[PDB]
Scaffold this motif. Structure first.
Motif, PDB file in Angstrom:
ATOM      1  N   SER A   1     -15.146  -0.571  -1.780  1.00  0.00           N
ATOM      2  CA  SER A   1     -14.306  -1.315  -0.863  1.00  0.00           C
ATOM      3  C   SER A   1     -13.367  -0.421  -0.066  1.00  0.00           C
ATOM      4  CB  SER A   1     -13.482  -2.352  -1.617  1.00  0.00           C
ATOM      5  OG  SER A   1     -12.513  -2.888  -0.736  1.00  0.00           O
ATOM      6  N   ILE A   2     -12.724   0.514  -0.759  1.00  0.00           N
ATOM      7  CA  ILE A   2     -11.840   1.488  -0.125  1.00  0.00           C
ATOM      8  C   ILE A   2     -12.643   2.454   0.748  1.00  0.00           C
ATOM      9  CG2 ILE A   2     -10.169   3.331  -0.517  1.00  0.00           C
ATOM     10  CD1 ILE A   2      -9.455   1.997  -3.143  1.00  0.00           C
ATOM     11  N   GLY A   3     -13.845   2.797   0.296  1.00  0.00           N
ATOM     12  CA  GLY A   3     -14.795   3.524   1.128  1.00  0.00           C
ATOM     13  C   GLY A   3     -14.711   5.036   1.031  1.00  0.00           C
TER      14      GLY A   3
ATOM     15  N   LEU B   1      -8.675   8.276  -1.999  1.00  0.00           N
ATOM     16  CA  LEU B   1      -7.321   8.295  -1.473  1.00  0.00           C
ATOM     17  C   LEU B   1      -6.775   9.710  -1.611  1.00  0.00           C
ATOM     18  CD1 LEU B   1      -6.225   4.848  -2.864  1.00  0.00           C
ATOM     19  CD2 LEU B   1      -6.691   5.458  -0.495  1.00  0.00           C
ATOM     20  N   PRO B   2      -6.195  10.239  -0.529  1.00  0.00           N
ATOM     21  CA  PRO B   2      -5.756  11.636  -0.527  1.00  0.00           C
ATOM     22  C   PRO B   2      -4.589  11.894  -1.463  1.00  0.00           C
ATOM     23  CG  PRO B   2      -5.037  10.535   1.459  1.00  0.00           C
ATOM     24  CD  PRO B   2      -5.966   9.586   0.771  1.00  0.00           C
ATOM     25  N   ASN B   3      -4.541  13.115  -1.993  1.00  0.00           N
ATOM     26  CA  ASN B   3      -3.394  13.625  -2.737  1.00  0.00           C
ATOM     27  C   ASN B   3      -3.194  12.973  -4.111  1.00  0.00           C
ATOM     28  OD1 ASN B   3      -2.985  15.206  -0.450  1.00  0.00           O
ATOM     29  ND2 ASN B   3      -1.731  13.613   0.516  1.00  0.00           N
TER      30      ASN B   3
ATOM     31  N   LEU C   1       0.846  -1.175   0.000  1.00  0.00           N
ATOM     32  CA  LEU C   1       0.000   0.000   0.000  1.00  0.00           C
ATOM     33  C   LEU C   1       0.900   1.250   0.000  1.00  0.00           C
ATOM     34  CD1 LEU C   1      -2.979  -1.072   2.334  1.00  0.00           C
ATOM     35  CD2 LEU C   1      -2.590  -1.475  -0.105  1.00  0.00           C
ATOM     36  N   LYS C   2       2.069   1.171   0.640  1.00  0.00           N
ATOM     37  CA  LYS C   2       3.057   2.257   0.538  1.00  0.00           C
ATOM     38  C   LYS C   2       3.605   2.409  -0.893  1.00  0.00           C
ATOM     39  CE  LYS C   2       4.317   2.018   5.405  1.00  0.00           C
ATOM     40  NZ  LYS C   2       3.689   3.343   5.690  1.00  0.00           N
ATOM     41  N   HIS C   3       3.887   1.277  -1.528  1.00  0.00           N
ATOM     42  CA  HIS C   3       4.276   1.244  -2.936  1.00  0.00           C
ATOM     43  C   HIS C   3       3.225   1.933  -3.802  1.00  0.00           C
ATOM     44  CE1 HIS C   3       6.044  -0.418  -6.631  1.00  0.00           C
ATOM     45  NE2 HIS C   3       4.860  -0.904  -6.955  1.00  0.00           N
TER      46      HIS C   3
HETATM   47  C1  OWP Z   1      -9.728  -3.382  -2.498  1.00  0.00           C
HETATM   48  O1  OWP Z   1      -9.079  -2.614  -1.511  1.00  0.00           O
HETATM   49  C2  OWP Z   1      -7.949  -1.897  -1.931  1.00  0.00           C
HETATM   50  C3  OWP Z   1      -7.465  -2.002  -3.220  1.00  0.00           C
HETATM   51  C4  OWP Z   1      -6.334  -1.289  -3.590  1.00  0.00           C
HETATM   52  C5  OWP Z   1      -5.836  -1.425  -5.012  1.00  0.00           C
HETATM   53  C6  OWP Z   1      -4.400  -1.917  -5.128  1.00  0.00           C
HETATM   54  C7  OWP Z   1      -3.671  -2.480  -4.064  1.00  0.00           C
HETATM   55  N1  OWP Z   1      -2.406  -2.865  -4.286  1.00  0.00           N
HETATM   56  C8  OWP Z   1      -1.844  -2.734  -5.477  1.00  0.00           C
HETATM   57  N2  OWP Z   1      -0.501  -3.136  -5.678  1.00  0.00           N
HETATM   58  N3  OWP Z   1      -2.490  -2.215  -6.494  1.00  0.00           N
HETATM   59  C9  OWP Z   1      -3.759  -1.804  -6.380  1.00  0.00           C
HETATM   60  N4  OWP Z   1      -4.443  -1.260  -7.501  1.00  0.00           N
HETATM   61  C10 OWP Z   1      -5.696  -0.445  -2.685  1.00  0.00           C
HETATM   62  C11 OWP Z   1      -6.186  -0.333  -1.396  1.00  0.00           C
HETATM   63  C12 OWP Z   1      -5.467   0.557  -0.391  1.00  0.00           C
HETATM   64  C13 OWP Z   1      -5.799   1.833  -0.110  1.00  0.00           C
HETATM   65  C14 OWP Z   1      -5.095   2.531   1.049  1.00  0.00           C
HETATM   66  O2  OWP Z   1      -5.562   2.426   2.165  1.00  0.00           O
HETATM   67  N5  OWP Z   1      -3.900   3.304   0.879  1.00  0.00           N
HETATM   68  N6  OWP Z   1      -3.297   3.496  -0.398  1.00  0.00           N
HETATM   69  C15 OWP Z   1      -2.277   4.519  -0.515  1.00  0.00           C
HETATM   70  C16 OWP Z   1      -2.430   5.635   0.534  1.00  0.00           C
HETATM   71  C17 OWP Z   1      -2.046   6.961   0.232  1.00  0.00           C
HETATM   72  C18 OWP Z   1      -2.191   7.973   1.180  1.00  0.00           C
HETATM   73  C19 OWP Z   1      -2.721   7.683   2.437  1.00  0.00           C
HETATM   74  C20 OWP Z   1      -3.110   6.380   2.736  1.00  0.00           C
HETATM   75  C21 OWP Z   1      -2.951   5.352   1.773  1.00  0.00           C
HETATM   76  C22 OWP Z   1      -3.360   3.905   2.064  1.00  0.00           C
HETATM   77  C23 OWP Z   1      -2.166   3.101   2.591  1.00  0.00           C
HETATM   78  C24 OWP Z   1      -1.269   3.947   3.483  1.00  0.00           C
HETATM   79  C25 OWP Z   1      -1.664   4.214   4.788  1.00  0.00           C
HETATM   80  C26 OWP Z   1      -0.867   4.992   5.619  1.00  0.00           C
HETATM   81  C27 OWP Z   1       0.334   5.504   5.144  1.00  0.00           C
HETATM   82  C28 OWP Z   1       0.735   5.239   3.843  1.00  0.00           C
HETATM   83  C29 OWP Z   1      -0.062   4.462   3.009  1.00  0.00           C
HETATM   84  C30 OWP Z   1      -7.307  -1.065  -1.029  1.00  0.00           C
HETATM   85  O3  OWP Z   1      -7.797  -0.979   0.271  1.00  0.00           O
HETATM   86  C31 OWP Z   1      -7.283  -2.019   1.063  1.00  0.00           C
END
Ligand code: OWP
Ligand code: NAP
Length: 163
Positions: free
Chosen positions: A50-52, A55-57, A29-31
Motif C-alpha cells: 500500500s505504501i509502495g 519510508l526513508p530514515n 503521518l508527521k506524528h
Molecule cells: C496504509 O497506508 C499507510 C499506512 C501507514 C501506517 C500508519 C499510519 N498512521 C498511524 N498512526 N500509524 C500507522 N502504523 C502509514 C502511511 C504513511 C506513510 C507516509 O507517507 N509517511 N510516513 C512518515 C514519513 C517519513 C518521512 C518522509 C515521508 C513520510 C510520510 C508522511 C510525510 C510526508 C512528508 C513529510 C513528512 C511526513 C501509509 O500510507 C498512507
C-alpha cells in the motif's frame, strides 16, 4: 528491544479501507514520522504494498511468506518469531493481521484515535483501558489541512498485581 504498536484507528477501530487509510490526515503521518525516524518498522506485506516504497530514515521490515520477496531498502522476515531478534525500538506498523498477532505481546501502543466513523474493511483488535494505562493523551490540532479531530494516545500495558 522495546516493542510498540503504532496505529491510527477510528471510533469503531477501523484502520483501513481497500488497502488505504480511510482518512486524509497529514498531521498523523508527521506524528508517525517523528516517532519512528531512526528506529524500526515491522509491517505485513499488504501494508507495505500500500505504501509502495520504504519510508526513508528508518529500518523497513516486511513480514511475508513470500520467499521471492526482495525489495531494495527493505529487510524481510518470514515469521513472527523473527521480530524478537530485531535490535532497538521496534514499531509494529500494521496491518490488521500483524496487530492481531502482536497486541498481546507489545510493551506499549502509540494510538491515534481518529474521532470519526469511516467505512472500513480492516480493524484494530478490541482492547480495554482496564488493561492499559494512559501514559499520555494529546489532542491533535485542527487546521485547513487537518480537519478531523484526533487524539494521540500513548498506552502502556498494566501489570497484573494481587488486589
Ligand atoms: C496504509 O497506508 C499507510 C499506512 C501507514 C501506517 C500508519 C499510519 N498512521 C498511524 N498512526 N500509524 C500507522 N502504523 C502509514 C502511511 C504513511 C506513510 C507516509 O507517507 N509517511 N510516513 C512518515 C514519513 C517519513 C518521512 C518522509 C515521508 C513520510 C510520510 C508522511 C510525510 C510526508 C512528508 C513529510 C513528512 C511526513 C501509509 O500510507 C498512507
Ligand atoms: N490505520 C493504520 O494505522 C494502519 C496501519 C497499517 C495498515 N493499515 C491498513 O491495514 C490494511 C491491511 O491489513 P491486512 O491485515 O489486510 O494486511 P497486512 O497485515 O498489512 O499484511 C498481511 C500479510 O502479512 C504477511 N503476514 C502476516 N502475518 C504473517 C506471519 N505470521 N507469517 C508470515 N507472513 C505473515 C502475509 O503476507 P503474504 O500473504 O505475502 O505471505 C499476509 O498476507 C490496509 O487497509 C491498510 O491501509 C492501517
Amino acid at each position: 528491544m522495546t516493542l510498540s504498536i503504532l496505529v491510527a484507528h477510528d471510533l469503531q477501530r477501523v484502520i483501513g479501507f481497500e488497502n488505504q487509510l480511510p482518512w486524509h490526515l497529514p498531521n498523523d503521518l508527521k506524528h508517525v514520522k517523528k516517532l519512528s525516524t531512526g528506529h524500526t518498522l515491522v509491517m505485513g506485506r499488504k501494508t507495505f504494498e500500500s505504501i509502495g516504497k520504504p519510508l526513508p530514515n528508518r529500518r523497513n521490515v516486511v513480514l511475508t511468506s513470500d520467499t521471492s520477496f526482495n525489495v531494495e531498502g527493505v529487510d524481510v522476515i518470514h515469521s513472527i518469531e523473527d521480530i524478537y531478534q530485531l535490535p532497538g525500538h521496534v514499531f509494529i506498523f500494521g496491518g490488521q493481521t500483524l496487530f492481531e498477532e502482536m497486541i498481546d505481546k507489545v510493551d506499549d501502543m502509540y494510538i491515534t484515535v481518529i474521532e470519526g466513523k469511516f467505512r472500513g474493511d480492516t480493524f484494530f483488535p478490541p482492547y480495554t483501558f482496564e488493561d492499559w494505562e494512559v501514559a499520555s493523551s494529546v489532542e491533535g490540532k485542527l487546521d485547513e489541512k487537518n480537519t478531523i479531530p484526533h487524539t494521540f494516545l500513548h498506552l502502556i500495558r498494566k501489570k497484573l498485581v494481587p488486589r
